[PDB]
PDB file of C-alpha atoms in Angstrom:
ATOM      1  CA  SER A   1      99.228 124.402 134.850  1.00 42.73           C
ATOM      2  CA  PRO A   2      97.307 127.558 135.913  1.00 41.35           C
ATOM      3  CA  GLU A   3      99.963 129.734 134.283  1.00 41.62           C
ATOM      4  CA  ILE A   4      99.795 130.169 130.457  1.00 40.88           C
ATOM      5  CA  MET A   5      96.560 128.305 129.636  1.00 41.17           C
ATOM      6  CA  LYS A   6      94.430 131.314 128.627  1.00 40.22           C
ATOM      7  CA  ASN A   7      96.443 132.673 125.688  1.00 46.09           C
ATOM      8  CA  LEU A   8      96.131 132.522 121.904  1.00 46.62           C
ATOM      9  CA  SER A   9      99.939 131.974 121.828  1.00 45.06           C
ATOM     10  CA  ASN A  10      99.731 128.245 120.904  1.00 42.35           C
ATOM     11  CA  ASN A  11      96.937 128.616 118.341  1.00 42.51           C
ATOM     12  CA  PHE A  12      98.861 131.502 116.726  1.00 45.24           C
ATOM     13  CA  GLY A  13     101.941 129.267 116.530  1.00 44.27           C
ATOM     14  CA  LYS A  14      99.805 126.483 114.974  1.00 46.98           C
ATOM     15  CA  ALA A  15      98.480 128.869 112.258  1.00 45.62           C
ATOM     16  CA  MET A  16     102.118 129.974 111.688  1.00 45.59           C
ATOM     17  CA  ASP A  17     103.181 126.276 111.514  1.00 46.26           C
ATOM     18  CA  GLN A  18     100.414 125.699 108.948  1.00 46.88           C
ATOM     19  CA  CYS A  19     101.957 128.548 106.871  1.00 44.95           C
ATOM     20  CA  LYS A  20     105.486 127.148 107.537  1.00 44.85           C
ATOM     21  CA  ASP A  21     104.144 123.878 105.989  1.00 45.48           C
ATOM     22  CA  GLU A  22     101.491 124.744 103.396  1.00 45.06           C
ATOM     23  CA  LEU A  23     103.793 127.478 102.101  1.00 44.84           C
ATOM     24  CA  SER A  24     106.951 125.690 103.300  1.00 42.92           C
ATOM     25  CA  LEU A  25     108.274 129.007 104.769  1.00 42.87           C
ATOM     26  CA  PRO A  26     111.918 128.565 105.890  1.00 41.99           C
ATOM     27  CA  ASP A  27     112.846 128.580 109.619  1.00 44.00           C
ATOM     28  CA  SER A  28     114.832 131.789 108.800  1.00 44.08           C
ATOM     29  CA  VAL A  29     111.635 133.545 107.572  1.00 43.73           C
ATOM     30  CA  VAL A  30     109.788 132.173 110.630  1.00 45.70           C
ATOM     31  CA  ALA A  31     112.557 133.495 112.948  1.00 44.18           C
ATOM     32  CA  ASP A  32     112.618 136.756 110.905  1.00 45.66           C
ATOM     33  CA  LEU A  33     108.829 137.065 111.504  1.00 44.70           C
ATOM     34  CA  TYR A  34     109.110 136.512 115.255  1.00 45.77           C
ATOM     35  CA  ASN A  35     111.981 139.113 115.369  1.00 44.52           C
ATOM     36  CA  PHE A  36     109.889 141.610 113.309  1.00 45.69           C
ATOM     37  CA  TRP A  37     107.510 142.808 116.064  1.00 46.81           C
ATOM     38  CA  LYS A  38     110.034 142.137 118.876  1.00 45.24           C
ATOM     39  CA  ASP A  39     111.547 145.632 119.323  1.00 45.24           C
ATOM     40  CA  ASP A  40     111.719 147.277 115.874  1.00 46.61           C
ATOM     41  CA  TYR A  41     112.858 145.309 112.806  1.00 45.50           C
ATOM     42  CA  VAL A  42     112.516 145.902 109.037  1.00 46.61           C
ATOM     43  CA  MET A  43     112.343 142.737 106.976  1.00 45.19           C
ATOM     44  CA  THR A  44     113.462 142.979 103.351  1.00 44.40           C
ATOM     45  CA  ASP A  45     112.296 139.489 102.169  1.00 45.71           C
ATOM     46  CA  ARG A  46     108.862 138.891 100.639  1.00 46.90           C
ATOM     47  CA  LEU A  47     108.188 135.453 102.177  1.00 47.73           C
ATOM     48  CA  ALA A  48     107.403 136.953 105.595  1.00 47.92           C
ATOM     49  CA  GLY A  49     104.599 138.949 103.874  1.00 48.04           C
ATOM     50  CA  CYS A  50     103.455 135.667 102.325  1.00 47.32           C
ATOM     51  CA  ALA A  51     103.336 134.194 105.880  1.00 49.46           C
ATOM     52  CA  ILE A  52     101.263 137.212 107.050  1.00 50.98           C
ATOM     53  CA  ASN A  53      98.630 136.809 104.256  1.00 48.40           C
ATOM     54  CA  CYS A  54      98.508 133.073 105.167  1.00 47.97           C
ATOM     55  CA  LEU A  55      97.952 133.753 108.915  1.00 49.47           C
ATOM     56  CA  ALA A  56      95.141 136.030 107.608  1.00 47.79           C
ATOM     57  CA  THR A  57      93.642 133.109 105.653  1.00 48.07           C
ATOM     58  CA  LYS A  58      93.649 131.218 109.035  1.00 46.65           C
ATOM     59  CA  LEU A  59      91.870 133.527 111.508  1.00 47.42           C
ATOM     60  CA  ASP A  60      89.940 130.396 112.679  1.00 47.05           C
ATOM     61  CA  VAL A  61      93.346 128.881 113.511  1.00 45.95           C
ATOM     62  CA  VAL A  62      94.748 132.071 115.156  1.00 44.38           C
ATOM     63  CA  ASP A  63      91.719 132.561 117.515  1.00 48.03           C
ATOM     64  CA  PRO A  64      89.622 129.352 117.629  1.00 47.03           C
ATOM     65  CA  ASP A  65      87.414 131.039 120.319  1.00 47.26           C
ATOM     66  CA  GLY A  66      85.764 132.875 117.379  1.00 46.80           C
ATOM     67  CA  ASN A  67      86.940 136.529 117.716  1.00 50.42           C
ATOM     68  CA  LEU A  68      89.462 136.996 114.897  1.00 49.44           C
ATOM     69  CA  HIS A  69      87.661 137.497 111.549  1.00 50.21           C
ATOM     70  CA  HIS A  70      87.703 139.838 108.532  1.00 49.58           C
ATOM     71  CA  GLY A  71      87.551 143.511 109.580  1.00 50.33           C
ATOM     72  CA  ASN A  72      86.804 142.122 113.084  1.00 52.48           C
ATOM     73  CA  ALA A  73      90.045 142.597 115.036  1.00 57.37           C
ATOM     74  CA  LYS A  74      87.872 144.563 117.515  1.00 60.69           C
ATOM     75  CA  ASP A  75      86.424 141.481 119.276  1.00 62.57           C
ATOM     76  CA  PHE A  76      89.907 139.923 119.207  1.00 59.75           C
ATOM     77  CA  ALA A  77      91.377 143.030 120.893  1.00 57.54           C
ATOM     78  CA  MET A  78      88.447 143.288 123.369  1.00 57.76           C
ATOM     79  CA  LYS A  79      88.975 139.698 124.642  1.00 57.92           C
ATOM     80  CA  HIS A  80      92.720 140.356 125.168  1.00 57.13           C
ATOM     81  CA  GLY A  81      93.445 143.922 126.218  1.00 54.52           C
ATOM     82  CA  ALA A  82      91.589 146.712 124.425  1.00 56.58           C
ATOM     83  CA  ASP A  83      88.300 148.597 124.569  1.00 56.43           C
ATOM     84  CA  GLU A  84      86.419 150.257 121.620  1.00 57.43           C
ATOM     85  CA  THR A  85      88.843 153.228 121.520  1.00 57.75           C
ATOM     86  CA  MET A  86      92.106 151.160 121.559  1.00 57.46           C
ATOM     87  CA  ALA A  87      90.419 148.507 119.375  1.00 57.41           C
ATOM     88  CA  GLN A  88      89.419 151.197 116.817  1.00 57.93           C
ATOM     89  CA  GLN A  89      92.820 152.993 116.979  1.00 53.05           C
ATOM     90  CA  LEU A  90      94.580 149.891 115.595  1.00 53.50           C
ATOM     91  CA  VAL A  91      91.919 149.463 112.881  1.00 54.33           C
ATOM     92  CA  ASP A  92      92.632 153.121 111.970  1.00 57.30           C
ATOM     93  CA  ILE A  93      96.410 152.439 111.733  1.00 58.14           C
ATOM     94  CA  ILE A  94      95.831 149.604 109.205  1.00 59.77           C
ATOM     95  CA  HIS A  95      93.039 151.562 107.432  1.00 56.49           C
ATOM     96  CA  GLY A  96      95.476 154.506 107.382  1.00 55.85           C
ATOM     97  CA  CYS A  97      98.545 152.597 106.187  1.00 56.74           C
ATOM     98  CA  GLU A  98      96.667 150.489 103.579  1.00 57.11           C
ATOM     99  CA  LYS A  99      95.623 153.671 101.681  1.00 56.51           C
ATOM    100  CA  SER A 100      98.864 155.609 102.264  1.00 59.35           C
ATOM    101  CA  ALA A 101     100.614 152.545 100.748  1.00 58.76           C
ATOM    102  CA  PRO A 102     102.486 153.006  97.419  1.00 59.20           C
ATOM    103  CA  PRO A 103     101.187 151.825  93.999  1.00 61.57           C
ATOM    104  CA  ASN A 104     102.057 148.154  94.471  1.00 64.18           C
ATOM    105  CA  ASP A 105      99.006 145.891  94.798  1.00 65.45           C
ATOM    106  CA  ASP A 106     100.536 142.431  95.504  1.00 63.13           C
ATOM    107  CA  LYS A 107      99.821 139.368  97.752  1.00 61.31           C
ATOM    108  CA  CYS A 108     103.011 139.559  99.822  1.00 58.62           C
ATOM    109  CA  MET A 109     104.709 142.916  99.157  1.00 60.01           C
ATOM    110  CA  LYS A 110     101.683 145.219  99.865  1.00 61.89           C
ATOM    111  CA  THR A 111     101.149 143.311 103.142  1.00 63.45           C
ATOM    112  CA  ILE A 112     104.816 144.087 104.028  1.00 63.75           C
ATOM    113  CA  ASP A 113     104.445 147.847 103.269  1.00 60.28           C
ATOM    114  CA  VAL A 114     101.188 148.243 105.249  1.00 59.20           C
ATOM    115  CA  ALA A 115     102.696 146.077 108.105  1.00 60.93           C
ATOM    116  CA  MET A 116     105.970 148.078 108.360  1.00 62.53           C
ATOM    117  CA  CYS A 117     103.934 151.309 108.130  1.00 65.83           C
ATOM    118  CA  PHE A 118     101.741 149.992 110.963  1.00 63.61           C
ATOM    119  CA  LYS A 119     104.753 149.613 113.311  1.00 60.37           C
ATOM    120  CA  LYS A 120     105.954 153.146 112.412  1.00 58.62           C
ATOM    121  CA  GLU A 121     102.465 154.435 113.390  1.00 58.29           C
ATOM    122  CA  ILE A 122     102.591 152.452 116.687  1.00 58.77           C
ATOM    123  CA  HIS A 123     104.769 155.448 117.698  1.00 61.10           C
ATOM    124  CA  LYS A 124     101.782 157.836 117.411  1.00 58.89           C
ATOM    125  CA  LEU A 125      99.530 155.742 119.707  1.00 57.82           C
ATOM    126  CA  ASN A 126     101.602 156.644 122.821  1.00 56.28           C
ATOM    127  CA  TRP A 127     100.842 153.178 124.167  1.00 57.72           C
ATOM    128  CA  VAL A 128     102.012 149.653 123.272  1.00 58.91           C
ATOM    129  CA  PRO A 129      99.676 147.141 121.618  1.00 57.90           C
ATOM    130  CA  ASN A 130     100.172 143.491 122.572  1.00 55.25           C
ATOM    131  CA  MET A 131     101.829 141.102 120.051  1.00 58.65           C
ATOM    132  CA  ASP A 132      98.210 139.878 119.776  1.00 60.75           C
ATOM    133  CA  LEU A 133      96.838 143.377 118.950  1.00 64.46           C
ATOM    134  CA  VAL A 134      99.569 144.055 116.333  1.00 61.46           C
ATOM    135  CA  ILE A 135      99.547 140.772 114.416  1.00 62.13           C
ATOM    136  CA  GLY A 136      95.766 140.249 114.735  1.00 62.63           C
ATOM    137  CA  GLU A 137      95.097 143.617 113.024  1.00 63.87           C
ATOM    138  CA  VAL A 138      97.155 143.020 109.838  1.00 57.51           C
ATOM    139  CA  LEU A 139      95.535 139.526 109.687  1.00 60.46           C
ATOM    140  CA  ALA A 140      91.996 140.959 109.940  1.00 59.19           C
ATOM    141  CA  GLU A 141      92.521 143.457 107.050  1.00 56.40           C
ATOM    142  CA  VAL A 142      94.772 141.362 104.668  1.00 58.82           C
TER     143      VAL A 142
END
């Protein structure tokens, strides 16, 4: 129907489902993930971070149109709801948080730190990035 047929929503969910399978992430971690960005939630598991680095291995599954790539969240933002300022702001949150991150260089835990930091810094934007814009950024950098 001419309703929800122009949205990366499904393809996102497929890349998540691939991580839910290829990593066998539990439905509780999947639900925890979807709750994470939903208002303001702190996860304390590590498997959600492992999901994030897997979504990041699957940018070609997240946006099969060809926007989402390494360091390339800008095109992905542009085709959704940003311009070069907004699309750079988010890059600067992850590029900020990734360096401000503690001495723990890990596959899942560092992702979690930089991702929770990112949501804290969504406060300083004084706008509200789309679910797309949030999750696509961590993916592009991880």
